[PDB]
Amino acid sequence: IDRLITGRLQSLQTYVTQQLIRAAEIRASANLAATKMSECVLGQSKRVDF
């Protein structure tokens, strides 16, 4: 039971760490989407290739 508990805890910690890194990437993309919505839908944009 101790061996199985150690293995399952390691697998769960790996899953949570990968989900945290993916959440950081998705948060960066969502901040970019909010900036694009504020600067291009609600007004004209003078930035090149934005």
Residues that bind a second copy (CB under 8 A): 1-2, 4-5, 7, 9, 11-14, 16-21, 23-28, 30-31, 33-34, 37-39, 42-43, 45-50
| CA dist., res. 24 & res. 46, Å (int) | 29
| Min CB(16)–a second copy separation in Å | 5
Widest CA span in the chain: 63
| CA dist., res. 6 & res. 3, Å (int) | 5
| Min CB(5)–a second copy separation in Å | 6
